[PDB]
Amino acid sequence: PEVATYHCGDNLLESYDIFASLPNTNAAKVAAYCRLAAAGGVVSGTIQVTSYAGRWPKVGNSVTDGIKFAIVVSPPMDKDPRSNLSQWLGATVFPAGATTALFSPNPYGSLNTITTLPSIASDWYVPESNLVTYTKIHFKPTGSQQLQLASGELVVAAAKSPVQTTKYELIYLGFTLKQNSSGTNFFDPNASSDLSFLTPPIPFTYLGYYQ
Amino acid sequence: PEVATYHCGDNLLESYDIFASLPNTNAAKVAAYCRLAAAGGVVSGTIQVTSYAGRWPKVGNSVTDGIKFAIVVSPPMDKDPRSNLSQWLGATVFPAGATTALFSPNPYGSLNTITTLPSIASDWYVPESNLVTYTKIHFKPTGSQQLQLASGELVVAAAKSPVQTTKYELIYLGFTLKQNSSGTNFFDPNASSDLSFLTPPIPFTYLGYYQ
Amino acid sequence: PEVATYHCGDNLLESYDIFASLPNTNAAKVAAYCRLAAAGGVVSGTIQVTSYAGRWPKVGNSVTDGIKFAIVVSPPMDKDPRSNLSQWLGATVFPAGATTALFSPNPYGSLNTITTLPSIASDWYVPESNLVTYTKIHFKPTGSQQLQLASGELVVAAAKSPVQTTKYELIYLGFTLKQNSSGTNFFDPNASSDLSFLTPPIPFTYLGYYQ
């Protein structure tokens, strides 16, 4: 197809289905929506993610450490179900029947630049310094006023997991949200459970499959 | 339409028609051209802007403060004329009859991430620290040699104004140009009126409307 | 054409045909691959590059200075052969017969923002500070472990060379790869000749020709 699209998650961002991996063998559920558009072998899209303190583990200091978490967008999960590391409920491809391969990072591009994720499909956070390669986007998230969120960074990395049955590449999306020094600790067990962060749809571009 | 385009402004950058809001209640006229391409609900485009010191307020010091201004791209101005905060002299859509909705920031993504602009249509500058969310783009503009222009940042934020009659989202483009320390002050009342800056066409991507 | 594509180079990154220009009248051969997709007058694409120390100059310090080089993508080389500063073996456009003009930076945009490269076909590196305008993209390359490659910047600038026979605009790609402070010096005369670096496919967006 000339233009193909892919989407997954909840565009209303009220259903907290999506498994995010967090630093130091932690995890949290988020709500997230990803939309991708592939044309000519190049893919641009967006990712948007929200979550609230009630869902988050109570270790570290968010003000000094950042609010850090990752999700995996897994185009080949329709043929490679164990690739679904973030436990998306489903994904939609237009035109119907178009190959999800259009949305995997390019096979030639990914050779020697891909990150192999830790096996445990419930502990695959990879710190930016350990990602093999990435593209970095700068944005500003919003959230509860006492969090004093100032800025964020998204890294976009080609990835695979040994749990997979195919060679199709996945998309690792690592987030770091940064607060001003006056912000409250999102990780404090006494923090209000309803404190939340919410990103805009953050854009990215990558090379996909094509002939 | 599989691919739709939107454009507005003067690609010759000779008509100083466009209203830019500036910090601390100020404003300035600029020349500008925006071109957007929507495919699969994702829009990629460019903005390019130029002005000169004769159009600019003469307060402060550009070397220390930066040269900062904001313009609004308003796709729904065809159905919401009050949304034309930057006073564009129309826009052109291809294919003819395609809806300008395609170019508004997505309503699902914009919910809780949109910035509501100051209500007077002649003073709606928002400092980056007060935008709700944005994507940030890094670039370098050119201009008169003596300004020693070195770099630039563009924030792209979904925005709305209470003056609007429709619920369609706008695009707030906030610019900060940075000079080397030895550059001359753009804001000096005795500086030459012909001193000028000119951005490249700076690219950006965002989530539009789709079915 | 509604969507058009352009590619050049070796997607296997095994053929070191491509001429990269380096600071201080140096040069190095690299293997590289570029893919571009044009829709609506807006072009998105990627560049990916690899090389090894045996091929690089043996003065300076890469840890202090960075690994800096430039590649030119030259869409009009089908009708302006002297424009092929990076000595690509050729390029491929789809649909067949589509003009390579689609992939040249926009002429109205390129006025007064374009960099005029040095007049020498084998010596056209321009430091970031001396580029007229650009957009900057943040990524992370990989390479030999001992280099400790940490990050990279790509600057994308519209360019022309005095050696050209046409007015069709070229794309200057300037790279800076950044190492941690304990990495080995890629330029040390006694560096292992096999030390290498490899970027991901780094995406960029620009305005092309359109009607």
Side-chain angles (χ1 to χ4, degrees):
Chain A
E2 266 221 311
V3 176
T5 65
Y6 183 91
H7 68 85
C8 57
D10 177 18
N11 67 0
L12 306 180
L13 303 170
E14 299 160 5
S15 185
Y16 296 83
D17 301 306
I18 310 306
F19 182 99
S21 292
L22 277 58
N24 304 122
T25 321
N26 283 289
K29 289 285 161 81
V30 300
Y33 179 78
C34 174
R35 172 85 162 198
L36 305 171
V42 186
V43 193
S44 294
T46 58
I47 185 65
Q48 180 166 38
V49 166
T50 184
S51 184
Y52 53 100
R55 297 268 175 177
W56 223 260
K58 312 300 178 216
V59 297
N61 179 338
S62 64
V63 180
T64 57
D65 304 349
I67 297 168
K68 280 183 175 165
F69 55 93
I71 68 180
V72 173
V73 167
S74 51
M77 66 184 175
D78 61 321
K79 64 202 68 158
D80 190 353
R82 299 185 77 190
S83 66
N84 195 6
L85 299 189
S86 286
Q87 300 170 1
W88 303 95
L89 296 178
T92 307
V93 168
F94 182 86
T99 182
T100 58
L102 294 173
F103 304 90
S104 293
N106 188 270
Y108 300 101
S110 302
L111 207 66
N112 306 307
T113 72
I114 193 160
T115 303
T116 297
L117 303 158
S119 289
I120 166 143
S122 70
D123 188 25
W124 38 261
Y125 184 83
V126 176
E128 285 184 15
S129 63
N130 296 324
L131 284 169
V132 178
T133 61
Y134 58 69
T135 296
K136 176 169 282 178
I137 303 89
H138 296 268
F139 62 99
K140 176 183 174 164
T142 193
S144 301
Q145 200 198 238
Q146 77 182 73
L147 295 181
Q148 297 289 289
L149 285 153
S151 66
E153 304 186 341
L154 167 65
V155 295
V156 177
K160 61 184 177 53
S161 178
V163 305
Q164 292 187 257
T165 60
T166 70
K167 297 188 150 213
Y168 291 111
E169 296 79 358
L170 314 179
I171 312 160
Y172 178 103
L173 297 174
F175 296 75
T176 303
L177 312 179
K178 183 173 167 69
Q179 301 169 255
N180 299 315
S181 44
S182 65
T184 60
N185 181 14
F186 191 75
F187 308 152
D188 190 287
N190 290 111
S192 171
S193 63
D194 71 345
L195 294 176
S196 62
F197 62 81
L198 169 59
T199 71
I202 307 155
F204 53 100
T205 299
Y206 62 97
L207 191 63
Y209 276 61
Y210 55 90
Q211 280 98 45
Chain B
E2 191 150 60
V3 181
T5 66
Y6 181 94
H7 66 84
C8 61
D10 178 13
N11 60 3
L12 295 177
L13 299 176
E14 281 172 12
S15 202
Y16 295 83
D17 295 319
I18 306 304
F19 182 90
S21 269
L22 279 54
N24 295 317
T25 313
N26 289 285
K29 287 277 179 184
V30 312
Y33 176 79
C34 178
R35 170 77 161 203
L36 311 169
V42 173
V43 179
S44 292
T46 59
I47 185 65
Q48 185 171 38
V49 186
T50 187
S51 201
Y52 58 93
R55 310 273 190 168
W56 228 257
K58 312 298 185 168
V59 290
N61 185 317
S62 63
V63 164
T64 70
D65 306 340
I67 306 173
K68 286 170 179 187
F69 57 96
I71 65 178
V72 175
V73 172
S74 46
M77 61 186 180
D78 64 320
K79 60 195 77 145
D80 194 348
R82 293 202 76 189
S83 71
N84 189 19
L85 287 188
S86 274
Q87 306 170 28
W88 300 94
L89 307 184
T92 299
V93 176
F94 184 88
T99 176
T100 50
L102 295 174
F103 306 96
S104 269
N106 192 265
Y108 303 102
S110 297
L111 199 83
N112 312 123
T113 64
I114 200 156
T115 295
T116 309
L117 297 175
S119 309
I120 63 167
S122 62
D123 183 17
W124 35 261
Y125 186 73
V126 182
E128 67 156 31
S129 72
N130 297 342
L131 293 158
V132 172
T133 61
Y134 57 68
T135 301
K136 180 175 287 186
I137 300 107
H138 297 279
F139 71 95
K140 173 186 182 188
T142 191
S144 309
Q145 178 151 56
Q146 79 185 254
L147 293 168
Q148 295 287 88
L149 281 154
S151 70
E153 295 179 357
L154 169 64
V155 293
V156 178
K160 67 180 168 72
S161 180
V163 304
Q164 290 183 256
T165 60
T166 74
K167 265 152 165 268
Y168 288 111
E169 294 79 357
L170 315 181
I171 311 167
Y172 178 98
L173 301 167
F175 293 79
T176 303
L177 326 178
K178 198 181 160 37
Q179 295 169 263
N180 290 325
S181 57
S182 67
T184 65
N185 178 11
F186 201 65
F187 311 154
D188 191 323
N190 305 124
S192 167
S193 268
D194 303 333
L195 294 167
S196 64
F197 65 82
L198 167 66
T199 73
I202 307 144
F204 57 100
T205 303
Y206 66 98
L207 193 64
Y209 278 60
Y210 52 97
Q211 234 84 338
Chain C
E2 190 150 72
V3 183
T5 68
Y6 182 97
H7 71 263
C8 58
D10 173 25
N11 59 12
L12 297 169
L13 301 174
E14 286 170 4
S15 192
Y16 293 79
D17 307 295
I18 308 313
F19 184 96
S21 226
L22 273 52
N24 321 291
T25 306
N26 288 276
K29 291 287 176 73
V30 300
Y33 180 75
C34 183
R35 175 67 161 201
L36 307 170
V42 175
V43 185
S44 299
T46 63
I47 184 70
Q48 177 165 40
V49 191
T50 183
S51 200
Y52 54 101
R55 283 206 183 258
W56 288 62
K58 303 296 168 217
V59 290
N61 191 303
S62 62
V63 178
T64 68
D65 307 335
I67 296 160
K68 295 179 177 177
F69 60 96
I71 296 161
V72 171
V73 171
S74 56
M77 70 181 174
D78 59 318
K79 68 203 83 170
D80 196 328
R82 289 186 87 203
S83 84
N84 182 11
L85 299 179
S86 277
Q87 317 166 8
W88 304 98
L89 302 179
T92 294
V93 173
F94 170 93
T99 189
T100 55
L102 300 173
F103 307 97
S104 268
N106 181 264
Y108 304 96
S110 297
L111 211 79
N112 301 304
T113 63
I114 199 165
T115 302
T116 302
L117 300 182
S119 276
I120 319 287
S122 52
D123 185 6
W124 39 262
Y125 180 86
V126 178
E128 273 184 18
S129 65
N130 298 328
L131 298 168
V132 178
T133 62
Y134 58 68
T135 297
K136 187 173 274 187
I137 302 109
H138 297 284
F139 66 89
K140 179 184 170 184
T142 196
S144 301
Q145 183 167 42
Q146 67 179 96
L147 293 179
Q148 315 244 298
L149 287 159
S151 69
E153 285 174 6
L154 171 63
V155 290
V156 175
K160 51 181 188 75
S161 169
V163 318
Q164 281 187 261
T165 58
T166 79
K167 288 169 154 186
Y168 288 112
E169 291 84 353
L170 319 171
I171 302 128
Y172 174 97
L173 303 166
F175 299 73
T176 302
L177 322 183
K178 183 182 182 41
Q179 294 164 269
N180 287 336
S181 73
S182 63
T184 67
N185 170 20
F186 195 68
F187 308 144
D188 185 281
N190 294 115
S192 164
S193 299
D194 301 313
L195 303 187
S196 65
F197 66 81
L198 165 65
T199 81
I202 305 149
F204 56 96
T205 302
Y206 65 97
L207 195 71
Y209 279 55
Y210 50 92
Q211 305 246 62

